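Task: complex structure prediction.
Instruction: return structure tokens for all chains below.
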Amino acid sequence: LDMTFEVDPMDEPTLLYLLFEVFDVVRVHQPHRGVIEAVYLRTPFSAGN
Amino acid sequence: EVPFVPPRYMAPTEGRNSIRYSELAPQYDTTRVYLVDNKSADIASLNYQNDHSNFLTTVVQNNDFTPAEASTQTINFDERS
Amino acid sequence: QAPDPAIRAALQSQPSGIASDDWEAAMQRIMALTTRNPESFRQQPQANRLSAILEAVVPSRTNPTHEKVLAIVNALAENKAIRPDEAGLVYNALLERVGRYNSTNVQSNLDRLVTDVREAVAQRERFKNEGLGSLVALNAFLATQPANVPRGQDDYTNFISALRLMVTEVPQSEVYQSGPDYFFQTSRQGLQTVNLSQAFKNLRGLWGVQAPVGDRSTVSSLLTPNSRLLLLLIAPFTDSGSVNRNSYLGHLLTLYREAIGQAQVDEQTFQEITSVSRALG
Amino acid sequence: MMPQWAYMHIAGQDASEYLSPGLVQFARATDTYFSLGNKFRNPTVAPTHD
Amino acid sequence: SKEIPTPYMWSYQPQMGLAAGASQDYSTRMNWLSAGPSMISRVNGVRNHRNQILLEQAAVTSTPRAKLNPRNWPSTLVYQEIPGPTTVLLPRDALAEVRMTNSGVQLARSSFTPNQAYLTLQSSSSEPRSGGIGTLQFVEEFVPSVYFNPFSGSPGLYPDEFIPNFDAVREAVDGYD
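Output:
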């Protein structure tokens, strides 16, 4: 993916802030009295399991 | 009579010995993962209060991802083992 | 009919001539047993006369998985589970899925499933031809207004029977429909002749009312054209209890039975009269 | 007077009653993207004699 | 209204000989908006009587068919011209002319020989035509369609081939692309 943003000039250094909209989600399991186990997912822009 | 010719099959690609990563193929059985002081300003943003005796680095080395971009990704071994 | 899904997989996934599957025929090309041309294999150049013997004496082993999965995908396409243009990415989605978790267990229940989808495809055409999806919808409609409780006569029982009979018989699958609210019969799938059957709120007060025979244009000549259409549609299923004086409804049925008779004898004599169809008079 | 009023929808049936039911289904099914509701008259007659 | 619908009027495509969809008879209709209840009821009765003669005429003159407006017509449903055999009468006793001229004579039913021959030819085209249909068949097909309770069923069973750009072979509508 390529994106070109055209923007007005500013006398100070600035940042383009992008939000790639995504499904960032978790599921949480609690099978025994002493424990909690979380499964994460982020569908585009993933970070594993 | 006729000859019996049993079928071939593909070993399971997320098998019990698979070593998964999101952007590439699964490796199997063994690899290397490397814990090295990656200097560049993207990872130096985590070095700031630190020194070489206690530091945060990225083990993810997919060269078209910048070290910041790659740092949030994950290496993900088979949960059955 | 819709074809065999496993034939239509094998037909597009497998060798066109001899394979390492049809060993029994290869061992009649070899050995010169083939009665139609015994000496043909004897005349092949050594370059392919010898390699053919190898693949017959020690057969190549193969992976069958792609033929199993495609025999599912072709079935899913024919049963209209998936759009035909999804078949390449549904094939791939299954191939990665069953290769990711591959085992002798999976390989067996793909085989079980190839028989199941092959039978499901054969059953689905029966389930469209038998019209059962319409007969269930009619049987649901008959719960909506007073079953087995008319007033002026029980010719209402014969008319209800004529609906079940007609919707069983008529082979273009006359579609009974729940609508959004009211129940409908479409008749033929091109719909021109749809009846709103919950609008037999006419044909309630009319059971038993005797025919005012001398002139149809009279005080009780009420029926909406939607109701006249239902009578005209069922007419070839209706002698039981409907004879003229039994009701105005019986009289309408005795006219519409013969009006249909008139239409098809005038077709038989029109297709005769039009013999030349071109200038000769 | 009444067919004029039932034909210009001043009296009689609701849009949920005079429209072909296919259009009524289509309307309900697409009403959150592209709303056809404002395009049909609903009459609201008052109770008369009692 | 749903019980006294206006008829759909089928259009024709002279290149193809196929029906180019249909639309209601928006060009034969009587304004009743200044009539009263009795006068309006006669307008309805006069339109009911029309709807009957259309359903009746379709039953008497139409090939009975499962698909409305089929995009090809079997050769058995088309009207072929079937003209009778051609018999020609041959101008020459050709065998007599060669033996005559070899003996030295010269030429310009042919008085030196009594013989004639009549030769009969098939006259009709060598395979029965199939395709679309001509205007005389088209008008004996395609009688106006009276659609009661119009658009009542499920989509996929609406009379889609009324739509003038529906590609009836594949349930899709013919775009510009």
